[PDB]
Enzyme design. Structure first.
Site, PDB file in Angstrom:
ATOM      1  N   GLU A   1      -9.296  -2.032  -0.738  1.00  0.00           N
ATOM      2  CA  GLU A   1      -8.159  -2.658  -1.422  1.00  0.00           C
ATOM      3  C   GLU A   1      -8.507  -3.392  -2.699  1.00  0.00           C
ATOM      4  OE1 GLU A   1      -5.531  -2.339  -0.489  1.00  0.00           O
ATOM      5  OE2 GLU A   1      -5.450  -1.764   1.642  1.00  0.00           O
TER       6      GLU A   1
ATOM      7  N   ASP B   1       0.883  -1.800  -6.229  1.00  0.00           N
ATOM      8  CA  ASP B   1       0.007  -0.911  -5.463  1.00  0.00           C
ATOM      9  C   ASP B   1       0.167   0.597  -5.780  1.00  0.00           C
ATOM     10  OD1 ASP B   1       2.039   0.112  -3.857  1.00  0.00           O
ATOM     11  OD2 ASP B   1       1.524  -1.163  -2.116  1.00  0.00           O
TER      12      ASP B   1
END
Ligand SMILES: [Cl-]
Ligand SMILES: [Cl-]
Length: 162
Positions: free
Chosen positions: A11, A20
């Site tokens: 991440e 994202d």
């Protein structure tokens, strides 16, 4: 290697709200703020998550803190879910990390689609499970990360991550 280092590799870390891979407002270590399109709705959620007026920016400590809460919640959600629990309980320590990773990324509800793969993992059919996992939007949208998680389930080692 452990679950924290693993997820920190997948991440990354960003201290300013970003979008994202699916286009949603996130911040920190993969901490989803909201699925709405509004940057304002994301600043408000952030503010609420941190307990201060952030103006969309947080410190390393604050990011780590959210991260600590999110792993804890992922694990607890797995343990409370009747479909996931038994799979998790049947796995060794490495493989448990792999299931947590998937739940952190996609939520208990994304994982719902994996009925067949989960059954194969429970049976310990590594190769088969690996194949089945790959036939998914997940794998096609984020192939590199999916490959790393998959290999972790196939092998039971952290090799995909050294
Ligand atoms: Cl929160
Ligand atoms: Cl990826």
């Amino acid at each position: 290697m452990n679950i924290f280092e693993m997820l920190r590799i997948d991440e990354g870390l960003r201290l300013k709200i970003y979008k994202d891979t699916e286009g949603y407002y996130t911040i920190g270590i993969g901490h989803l703020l909201t699925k709405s399109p509004s940057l304002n709705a994301a600043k408000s959620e952030l503010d609420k998550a941190i307990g201060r007026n952030t103006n969309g920016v947080i410190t390393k400590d604050e990011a780590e803190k959210l991260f600590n809460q999110d792993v804890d919640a992922a694990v607890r959600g797995i343990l409370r879910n009747a479909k996931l629990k038994p799979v998790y309980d049947s796995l060794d320590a490495v493989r448990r990390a792999a299931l947590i990773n998937m739940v952190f990324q996609m939520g208990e509800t994304g994982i719902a689609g994996f009925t067949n793969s989960l059954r194969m993992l429970q049976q310990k059919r590594w190769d088969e499970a690996a194949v089945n996992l790959a036939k998914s939007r997940w794998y096609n949208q984020t192939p590199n990360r999916a490959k790393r998680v998959i290999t972790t389930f196939r092998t039971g080692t952290w090799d995909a991550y050294k």
